[PDB]
Amino acid sequence: KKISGGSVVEMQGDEMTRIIWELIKEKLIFPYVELDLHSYDLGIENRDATNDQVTKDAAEAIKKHNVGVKCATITPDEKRVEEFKLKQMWKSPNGTIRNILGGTVFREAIICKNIPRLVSGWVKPIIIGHHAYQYRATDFVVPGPGKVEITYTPSDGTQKVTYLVHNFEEGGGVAMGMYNQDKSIEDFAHSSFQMALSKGWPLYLSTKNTILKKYDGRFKDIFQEIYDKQYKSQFEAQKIWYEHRLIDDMVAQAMKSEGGFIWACKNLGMMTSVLVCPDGKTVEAEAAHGTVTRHYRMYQKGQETSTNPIASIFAWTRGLAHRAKLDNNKELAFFANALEEVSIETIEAGFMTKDLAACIKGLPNVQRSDYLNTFEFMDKLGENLKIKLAQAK
C-alpha cells in the first residue's frame, strides 16, 4: 500500500513548469502518496476561460484545506494578451491568492554543497521573510506652493495631533501618507516565530529604528512583546533565540555567519516561496521562479530541455511536510524529508541539470555529459527515491 496523504490543494500552471509539475506528480508523488487532491488548473487559457474564477476558488480551497502547492503561472502583460488573445490583463494569481489568504512570504534557498554561492561561508539555508498586504499608501501630486500636514484624530475627538510634513515654498512636488496597523505587525511576528519554530533556527528582525524611530520602533517593540509573552519558552525548548538588529549591522554580521536563521525584513530553480498565514495552520508553497518560457519554446520546437525541478519539488515537500505536521502523519513527514534528501544527494553526487552544470564549469565549458536533460534528471531522482524509500521499509 501507499501513504495516505490527506487533503491537498494542488494548482497547475503554465509553460515549462506545467510539464515538470506533471512529471513531479507522475514520477515522485503519485507512486508513493495517495491524496484527496483538490486540483485547480491555473493555466492562462483556463483562467481566461473562467474569467479568473478558478484562481478565487483555488484560494478558497487553500483556506479550507490549509495546504496549497502551486505551479508557476504567467502574469499577463500586453504581449501575453496578444499571444493568448486574452479578454483582460488578468491579475497575478499569486496576488489574488495572497489577498484572500493573507500572511507572510518566506523565501528559502536549497543548498547543495557543490553548487557555488554568493557567500561561500553560507552552508545552512537563510530564510528571508517580508510581510504581505506601500500598497495601501495614499500618494498625491502637490501642484504648487502650500503646506502638507498629517493629522491624527482619535475616535473620541480629544488628543488630536497635527504634524507639518513639508511647507512647499518654491513650487510643487509629491507627497504621501503611509500606515501600518498593529494587527499586521503582530501577524508578521507570529508567522516569523511559527516559521522559526517549524525550522528549528534562530530568528532575527531588521529595521531602521534610527531613521524611523517611531515607525520601525513599533515593529521592534511588538516582536519583542510577542516573543516574551508567547514564544520565549518554546524557543528555549528547541535551543533557538530571537534578536533585533539594525539593517547595516545585520548585513555585516550575516556575511561572517554560516547561515541557518530566519530573517524578518521590514522593507534560480533552487529557491522556494512559502506563504505562512498568521493562524499557523494555512501554508501555500511554490517555486520562487517563473514559467521558464525559454525552455518551453525549445520544448515546442522539439529541442531537448534541461529544466531544474528542485524548486518545484520543494514546493511539494514543504506543503506535504506541513500537511503531515497538521495531521500528525509520520509516514508523510518521512516521505517529504526523504524526497528533499534525495534531491540534494543527487546533485551532490554530480547528477544535475544544465543550469547547475553551468554554475560549476561555466556555460562555454559545459559538455552534454556534464548534465542530464529534464527527463533523465527526473528519472535519476525517481531511482534514488525508490532506493531511499525501499531502505526505509
108 binds ligand ZT3 (CB under 6 A): yes
346 binds ligand NAP (CB under 6 A): no
From the list ligand ZT3, ligand NAP, a copy of itself, none, partner contacted by residue 254 (C-beta under 5 to 8 A by kind): ligand ZT3
Cα separation, 267 vs 263, in Å, equals: 12
Restricting to residues 344-363, which ones interact with a copy of itself according to CB under 8 A?
Answer: 362-363
Residues 6+ apart with CB under 8 A from 53: none
One residue of 68, 269, 278, 319 binding ligand NAP per CB under 6 A: 269
Residues 6+ apart with CB under 8 A from 313: 24, 28, 339, 340, 343, 381
Cα separation, 219 vs 180, in Å, equals: 10
Restricting to residues 49-88, which ones interact with ligand NAP according to CB under 6 A?
Answer: 72-75, 80
What is the three-class DSSP state of 256?
A: coil
# chain residues binding a copy of itself, by CB under 8 A: 60
Restricting to residues 262-291, which ones interact with ligand ZT3 according to CB under 6 A?
Answer: none
Restricting to residues 121-150, which ones interact with ligand ZT3 according to CB under 6 A?
Answer: 122, 125-126, 128
Q: What are phi and psi of 96, to 5 degrees?
A: -60, -45
Question: What is the largest distance, in Å, between two alpha-carbon atoms of the chain?
Answer: 78
From the list ligand ZT3, a copy of itself, ligand NAP, none, partner contacted by residue 166 (C-beta under 5 to 8 A by kind): a copy of itself
One residue of 176, 251, 349, 387 binding a copy of itself per CB under 8 A: 176
259 binds ligand ZT3 (CB under 6 A): yes
From the list ligand NAP, ligand ZT3, a copy of itself, none, partner contacted by residue 163 (C-beta under 5 to 8 A by kind): a copy of itself
From the list ligand ZT3, a copy of itself, ligand NAP, none, partner contacted by residue 84 (C-beta under 5 to 8 A by kind): none
From the list ligand NAP, a copy of itself, ligand ZT3, none, partner contacted by residue 308 (C-beta under 5 to 8 A by kind): ligand NAP
262 binds ligand NAP (CB under 6 A): no
User: 42-76 burial by CB neighbour count: b if 16+ within 10 A, else e?
Assistant: bbbebbbeeebebbbebbebbbebbbbbbbbbbbb
Q: Which residue is nearest to ligand NAP (CB)?
A: 290
Residue of 108, 141, 132, 106 lying closest to 122 (CA atoms):
108
In one letter, which amino acid is 358?
A
What is the three-class DSSP state of 46?
A: helix
Q: Which helix (H) or strand (E) holds 65?
A: helix 53-65
289 binds ligand NAP (CB under 6 A): yes
Cα separation, 241 vs 204, in Å, equals: 9
Torsional sign, CA 86, 91, 93, 97: negative
In one letter, which amino acid is 165?
V
Q: Which residues bind ligand ZT3 (CB under 6 A)?
A: 107-109, 111, 117-118, 122, 125-126, 128, 251, 254-255, 259
Q: Which residues bind a copy of itself (CB under 8 A)?
A: 118, 120-121, 134-156, 161, 163-166, 168-185, 208, 211-218, 362-363
